[PDB]
């Protein structure tokens, strides 16, 4: 038996409602379980027996459906709720056992909070970087919704290669984000070089730092 | 609860035992104990499932053939799997489900890493700008395999602290940075990285400017 979640992702308002879906191939009747994880985290149990809640879950999950179809909601979307979700096959026809088995692709939530703008830290490369061969030169975006795009410069020439992106799980709290971009390149190509620029952009929004190799 | 071991970095090809220890219940009350990993940025993936009353097990239509799952005692559970490649590299969980209830308890996993390459220990850098407030932090550069732990001041500095996931490199190393605010008025903040594959412990106090 195959199980298919759908969508892949989905972004739900604050106060909003959500529902994901999950199909099996064949039918399993009511034995099917919902997992919520978090970022970084094993994941939870929220329904078990497709509308059963586990102890602890918060009556704002439900499930629904019997057979190949089931749903689950979210009625009232919090921060928190920004997880990605998987279902999961609990009964096995051939065997007739009712172990937990297969998954289902997952679905991420994306939760729309409201909007703040990021402020942006550049920080240059420690001194001992560069006896080491290679130079890594981080930018931080602070505390922002929603997603923005960061583009490194150097000496006015947009970088393609040697970037790395990190994001913080969005903020049970505020729903926003913390983000760490870092420029990788060589110490020949960081000496060769003097104007290093970290460009954040939300929208129609952008907020620049900048060092100098000399300055620092 | 319940405790994942036997994880570490192995080469493409190599063979692995894992286990599943079990506190506060037995295997010799009925249960499914379970394997279930995780790569990394995508899915929960079944592996097998087995009944600890009579050891009778259930496996993925992937996995039969190539991973074992056994029950070695009434607290251990393990899981041999063979020939193991790159798309192996994942967090094996073990967890434990009753009969058609989900599974309610989960190990925190093991990580599992298979690569070619050797170990390699962290640098460590400082992270500081070119204020009544300021933000500082520490690189954690050039590693394998995973996990580093990067904590502030012995964990005794709580507000202000953004540690972010860390990223594999092109070259296959990792690295991660965190970061600390603080004002004017705080004492210095000293990050604590250890890279337990490498026995590497570093302390370094970060100093504004």
């Known amino acids: 038996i195959v199980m298919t979640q759908t969508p892949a992702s989905v972004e739900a308002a604050v106060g909003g409602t959500v529902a994901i879906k999950c199909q099996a191939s064949q039918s399993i009747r009511s034995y099917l379980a919902w997992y919520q994880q978090k970022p970084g985290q094993p994941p939870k149990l929220l329904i078990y027996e497709a509308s059963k809640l586990a102890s602890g879950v918060p009556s704002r999950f439900s499930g629904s459906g019997s057979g190949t179809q089931f749903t689950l909601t979210i009625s009232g979307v919090e921060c928190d709720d920004a997880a990605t979700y998987y279902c999961?096959?609990?009964?096995?026809?051939?065997?007739?056992?009712?172990?937990?088995?297969?998954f289902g692709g997952g679905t991420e939530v994306v939760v729309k909070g409201d909007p703040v703008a990021p402020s942006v830290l550049i920080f240059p490369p420690a001194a001992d970087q560069v006896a080491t061969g290679t130079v890594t030169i981080v930018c931080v975006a602070n505390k922002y919704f929603p997603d923005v795009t960061v583009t490194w410069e150097v000496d006015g020439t947009t970088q393609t290669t040697g970037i790395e992106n990190s994001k913080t799980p969005q903020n049970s709290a505020d729903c926003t984000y913390n983000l760490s971009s870092t420029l990788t390149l060589t110490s020949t190509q960081y000496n060769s070089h003097k104007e290093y620029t970290c460009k954040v952009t939300q929208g129609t929004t952008s907020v620049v730092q900048s060092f100098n190799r000399g300055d620092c | 609860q319940l405790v994942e071991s036997g994880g570490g970095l192995v080469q493409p090809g190599a063979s692995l035992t894992l286990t599943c220890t079990a506190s506060?219940?037995?295997?010799?009350?009925?249960?499914?104990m379970c394997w279930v990993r995780q790569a990394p940025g995508k899915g929960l993936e079944w592996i097998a499932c087995?009944?600890?009353?009579?050891?009778?097990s259930y496996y993925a239509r992937w996995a039969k053939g190539r991973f074992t799952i056994s029950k070695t005692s009434s607290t251990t559970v393990t899981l041999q799997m063979t020939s193991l490649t790159a798309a192996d590299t994942a967090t094996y969980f073990c967890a434990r489900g009753g009969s058609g209830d989900g599974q309610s308890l989960w190990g925190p996993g093991t990580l599992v890493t298979v690569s070619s390459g050797q170990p390699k220990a962290p640098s460590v850098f400082p992270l500081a700008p070119c204020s009544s407030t300021v933000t500082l932090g520490c690189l954690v550069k050039g590693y394998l395999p995973e996990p580093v732990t990067v904590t502030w001041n012995s964990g005794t500095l709580t507000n202000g602290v953004r540690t972010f996931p860390s990223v594999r490199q092109s070259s296959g190393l990792y690295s991660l940075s965190s970061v600390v605010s603080v004002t004017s008025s705080s004492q210095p903040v000293t990050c604590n990285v250890a890279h337990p594959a490498t026995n590497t412990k570093v302390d370094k106090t970060v100093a504004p400017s």
């Open positions: 506060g219940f037995s295997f010799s009350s009925d249960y499914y």
């Open positions: 999961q096959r609990n009964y096995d026809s051939y065997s007739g056992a009712y172990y937990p088995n297969g």
């Open positions: 087995i009944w600890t009353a009579n050891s009778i």
